[PDB]
Design a binder for this molecule. Structure first.
Ligand SMILES: CCC(=O)SCCNC(=O)CCNC(=O)[C@H](O)C(C)(C)COP(=O)(O)OP(=O)(O)OC[C@H]1O[C@@H](n2cnc3c(N)ncnc32)[C@H](O)[C@@H]1OP(=O)(O)O
Ligand SMILES: CCC(=O)SCCNC(=O)CCNC(=O)[C@H](O)C(C)(C)COP(=O)(O)OP(=O)(O)OC[C@H]1O[C@@H](n2cnc3c(N)ncnc32)[C@H](O)[C@@H]1OP(=O)(O)O
Lengths: 247, 145, 261, 261, 247, 247
């Protein structure tokens, strides 16, 4: 498979409306070499996808959100499943590629009573300590703290990309206007300005949180070149016996 | 392909040897590369004659059009010294008017005596050549109008 | 003449009072102390040193550029001190202004204190009371959260990190305490939850009280997130002072040895 | 109906246009090229990957928050490329907007590419054309200069850093080239000085010309600051390419070995 | 000498007017233990003071600006002398204390022809490379790149302090108003906003570039304390045989 | 360019008389591959030549004395430029080749007032600490401390060669005769035996300070061979954060 192969069928895979879901495995198949993907835990915590693939002949780890199942939300099982896989990939010099489409964490008393905070911390730490090259692509949305947990640029990430449909926001628009504009009682326009100004990758791109906004059809060619230049990545960290995983 | 014409050039392409043997459309030629600069200048001895060429890429060639040509103060009015030898006598003093074919100084070198003449009409402002002096090649001697 | 001085004392007293006397009174009527009172109670007398006392947020939209929205310190009191003679670095969230929500300056102060502590090799103690991130701040709050998380992960196993939650903590203000080594809670006044009860009712269609959703009892008896719960702020701070004596200052140091009678 | 796509395309077009066609024409009439053309000549064809394309300044003082002076890119274009197959990281300062003065975003982009280069272990090439610092921005420009200086000092002896002054460099834009391993200039178009001739006349009370005060000949003949001088931008870039062919990529690599004939 | 003694004589040592000068050696003597100072090159490049003193019994290197001669401006000899002293102090684990009062570098064609850029880079490298504890106090002013040259906070400095008479800005008010305001054609009140909005240590404190604005009388008590906290400072840097100082 | 190419044109480039000068650039061009040389600082401090070239394909740094300008005497600018170039070449594992023809340092009160000692120590240190392979060839003269400053054998140099026209001595014949035989008053012969005995490379050769006395035409074929065996050079030095260059 040529490294600069164009992948045009991803140009319209993401639906225009945010209430309709798609399959991230389709994107993963379209991007990786020969459309071959060894998925790990394919029938457990389906709202997250982890696996091994190849880019330009080099084995890579793939972690992504699944909007088809549970609207792509994060929970305990997905957090643990992603965290251990990321830790293994980091431990053995395997590069990581992340596909981000997440509205946040799954709410409810069952998640709080199970310790969702601990497992979210597990996943955040797993992406945080990684010293292998990391390439991140935001497809549709990344809301709230989940945006940090999904290998953002500020976790010593290497390259971050955003598709034209990306939405890096603090939270949902309705909650944002209800917490900002309380007594304004004129939300009809406030929706217009808020959507026009913050429902796009522009706030993140204007301050360098994403390297560039790329066309989806050039995703693969964008990743491989990065993996060509990041193969010699080498960083140093303070000495310790080990760290304290939030298990 | 030069201006449409298609040619084939083959050789061992040994860039270190002083002489290079190539074959252009079957015709065997021998060339020398006397000089080469990173800016594209190249002096090539071909058929016994040294040609100066400037090779650039198409993008560099089209971007070179914006470069301002540096003004040079070599607007004649000065004659150098072709003889690298010794000048016997100088027939021009400062303030003297000169003309075309007017001998300035007589300077000899290597069993030959040459009397260089002014190539244009003018009046010298300063004379840097004196009788019985050792003057090398390419040395200014007269500064006319 | 020079007007710089009296402006310096105005900013000093504004920082000391935080966000006015009314907000402090509201804080006290809930049975909760202020950030500076907690700092004074936790550290040795006459040993606390401020850091970044004159900072404000850089926000300029949603009317945040008005002088009524500019608070020196910006919802966190950061500095260094000594407990029983041993160095420590502390930060305390100020619920008085903007509900303690994190902004650019807030995260900058926390990151600076953490960097200084990891440079010198001293533990970090954090008193948490924050309503989440500033929505009108923008994606800057997300960057601050990510920077703090990266510094917690980098400092994990190098210097001890202790967290004490003394109030409500919603949104992104819960992952940082989880990354620290130990987590302590205050009964009946502290909370820990990703989303509020209103969102739970809206999505999962079930009614729940904040206390029974993210209270100290829930997080100390059935979820395993917090390590201990204390009666109130004074008792929690005294127990934190007692507990700090057990730990070494850094991983380069051996286990502390005290005199035995 | 999504309006994001045409906004993206419009800001792509404005970013490639720099600061308008009028300023590009006025900058070409001086015998100098723009940053993008310089990078196109310097690197291999079809090998330039540009980073931080939509980054804009965050200044909101002296009326610079208006949309009339919000240029994407913000006076610098940064990225990575290959010279004869060897990786390199380049930044080129864009004199088109605000005289190429450095902002928070400008220094942020340069620091980003410097950090990437030092992490990967590749040389850094800087095409310097900057009139100084943004006076309207204040201490942010000083912080940016200090960050660049710290990165230059830290990267000294680790990766080769090459500066090519292709325009007038005044004020704080002169220390960073001095900390790099090599410094090349372009005749009759590049200048290097801390204070301009006007300040010298105001203080020292003596007439001096732009070229004699900071021209290429002054710094390559009597000052010992620059290492070489070239006729024009194209010649300078070709000679810089040839010179870069000599050096190794990192201090942890042996001297490069080519093939002999 | 008790480490917590006050120095009220420094309360009004800085003159109100920016033109009047003062002796920084007086401040150095008032701050150090027993007012004992071993000066290096006291008769060469007098617009800078370098020397050895003691704080709480610990040997410290002191670098400061001298507004008495040359108005505190930096030049060839001062930069070289300060850079060499700072390099020696850093090489032998000697903490550095800096007193900053500098309006910039010395103008003139002689400085330009002598290579003022190279020696300014010498001093900047010397202050940036040092990994020993560095305590900085700004007394009156710090303008332009000189502020960066004098061990600012962004050069990996440890503690930076400003007296109430300090002022940090890109350059003087006249130049700023003449470069920014051109079409206003009336510098009558615009001078007033610029002066009472930027001629103070308030911008740097607001961005957090200085840790605190301290009273001069506490300076000694402010330093010694810090000086015993930073005794265990330890940082790591990338490997190299040696760096290429701009000599 | 073959590594064993002879250069007979160098056999007579050194004039017999000690007053007439030659061009070191011709020697450098003849020695190096394809006669290609990248001059560094060509128009400033012209009494010394530094630059980059290739030997058998590998990058080498060249430093040499220029007898055309100032008779090859060292001064401020030449010392500074050579020191900086040597430091850069050493820092990035670039071998150094030195051509030595120096009568000493340039005398005068302008050099003493400018601190010729400091910059001479700069250059001497620059060669002294270098751990990259260095090959030295003496062409005509090496007098006094300058011979030590020009990468002598005793600075942990690898190979040192002397041409048949080389001359290593404490000073010229004159000063030696009027110092040793000040009271003898028999200089007419003392000149003759002193010139016959010490005005030649034999005193350096018999004490072992030069590996061999080589014919000029074999210079290149020598140096390449050395560069083939010194590529694996590895030395050890005492630990330090950094040293104190005499800047
Ligand atoms: C990265 C992940 C994210 O995006 S987190 C987004 C923010 N998450 C939130 O939950 C904010 C909503 N806040 C709340 O629900 C309440 O303040 C909670 C957390 C329940 C606190 O309980 P309670 O003791 O009753 O406080 P309160 O209702 O009296 O509020 C007082 C003042 O606090 C402020 N506050 C709180 N959070 C923020 C915030 N994120 N941004 C800005 N302001 C905040 C409120 O403005 C409120 O102001 P006021 O005094 O009522 O006028
Ligand atoms: C921390 C370090 C510092 O304190 S640096 C302080 C700045 N020092 C200065 O001398 C002012 C900067 N400008 C200059 O020096 C000269 O204008 C130089 C750079 C030589 C320009 O040369 P020249 O081509 O002949 O003038 P020009 O009219 O064609 O270009 C000027 C246009 O560019 C702009 N410019 C330039 N520098 C800045 C700057 N630092 N900040 C903001 N804008 C700058 C000017 O506004 C001007 O714009 P315009 O085209 O007149 O609208």
């Amino acid at each position: 498979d040529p490294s600069d192969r164009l992948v045009p069928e991803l140009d319209t895979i993401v639906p225009l409306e945010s209430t309709k879901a798609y399959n991230m495995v389709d994107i993963i198949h379209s991007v990786v070499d020969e459309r071959e993907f060894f998925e790990i835990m394919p029938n457990y915590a389906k709202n997250i996808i982890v696996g091994f693939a190849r880019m330009n002949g080099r084995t890579v780890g793939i972690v992504g959100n699944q909007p088809k199942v549970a609207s792509g939300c994060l929970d305990i099982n997905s957090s643990v499943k992603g965290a251990r896989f990321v830790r293994f990939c980091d431990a053995f010099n395997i590069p990581l590629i992340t596909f981000v489409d997440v509205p946040g964490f799954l709410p409810g008393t069952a998640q709080e009573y199970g310790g969702i905070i601990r497992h979210g911390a597990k996943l955040l730490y797993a992406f945080a300590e990684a010293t292998v090259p990391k390439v991140t692509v935001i497809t549709r949305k990344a809301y709230g703290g989940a945006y940090d947990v999904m290998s953002s640029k500020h976790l010593c990430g290497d390259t971050n990309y955003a598709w034209p449909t990306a939405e890096i926001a603090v939270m949902g628009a309705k909650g944002a206007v209800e917490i900002i504009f309380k007594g304004h009682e004129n939300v009809e326009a406030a929706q217009a300005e808020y959507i026009e100004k913050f429902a796009n990758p522009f706030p993140a791109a204007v301050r360098g949180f994403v390297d560039d906004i790329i066309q989806p059809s050039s995703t693969r060619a964008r990743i491989c070149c990065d993996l060509d230049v990041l193969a010699s990545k080498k960083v140093q960290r303070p000495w310790r016996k080990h760290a304290n995983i939030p298990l | 392909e030069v201006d449409g014409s298609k040619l084939n050039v083959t050789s061992t392409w040994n860039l270190a040897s002083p002489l290079l043997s190539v074959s252009v459309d079957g015709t065997q030629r021998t060339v020398q590369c006397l000089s080469r600069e990173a800016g594209g200048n190249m002096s090539i001895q071909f058929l016994g004659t040294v040609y100066k060429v400037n090779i650039l890429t198409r993008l560099a060639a089209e971007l070179n059009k914006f470069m301002l040509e540096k003004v040079t103060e070599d607007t004649s009015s000065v004659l150098r010294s072709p003889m690298p030898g010794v000048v016997v006598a100088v027939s021009v003093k400062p303030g003297d008017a000169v003309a075309e074919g007017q001998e300035i100084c007589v300077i000899e070198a290597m069993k030959m005596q040459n009397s260089m003449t002014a190539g244009k009409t003018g009046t010298v402002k300063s004379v840097h050549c004196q009788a019985g002096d050792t003057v090398g090649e390419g040395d200014l001697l007269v500064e006319l109008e | 003449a020079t007007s710089v001085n009296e402006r310096i004392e105005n900013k000093r007293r504004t920082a000391l009072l935080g966000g006015g006397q009314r907000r402090i009174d509201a804080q006290h009527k809930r049975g909760k102390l202020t950030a500076r009172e907690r700092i004074s109670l936790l550290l040795d007398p006459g040993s606390f040193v401020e850091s970044d006392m004159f900072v404000e947020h850089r926000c300029a939209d949603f009317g945040m550029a008005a002088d009524k929205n500019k608070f020196p310190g910006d919802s966190v009191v950061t500095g260094r001190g000594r407990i029983n003679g041993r160095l420590v670095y502390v930060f305390s969230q100020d619920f008085t202004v903007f509900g303690g929500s994190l902004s650019g300056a807030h995260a900058q102060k926390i990151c600076k204190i953490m960097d200084q502590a990891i440079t010198v090799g001293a533990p970090v103690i954090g008193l948490n009371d924050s309503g989440g991130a500033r929505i009108q701040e923008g994606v800057e709050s997300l960057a601050g959260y990510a920077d703090i998380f990266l510094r917690n992960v980098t400092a994990s196993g190098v210097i001890p990190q202790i967290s004490l939650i003394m109030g409500p903590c919603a949104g992104g203000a819960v992952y940082s305490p989880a990354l620290t080594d130990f987590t302590f809670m205050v009964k009946d006044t502290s909370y820990l939850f990703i989303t509020g009860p209103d969102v739970v009712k809206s999505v999962t269609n079930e009614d729940v009280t904040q206390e029974e959703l993210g209270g100290a009892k829930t997080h100390t008896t059935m979820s395993g997130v917090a390590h201990r719960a204390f009666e109130n702020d004074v008792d929690a701070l005294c127990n934190l002072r007692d507990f700090f004596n057990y730990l070494p200052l850094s991983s380069q140091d051996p286990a502390p040895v005290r005199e035995c009678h």
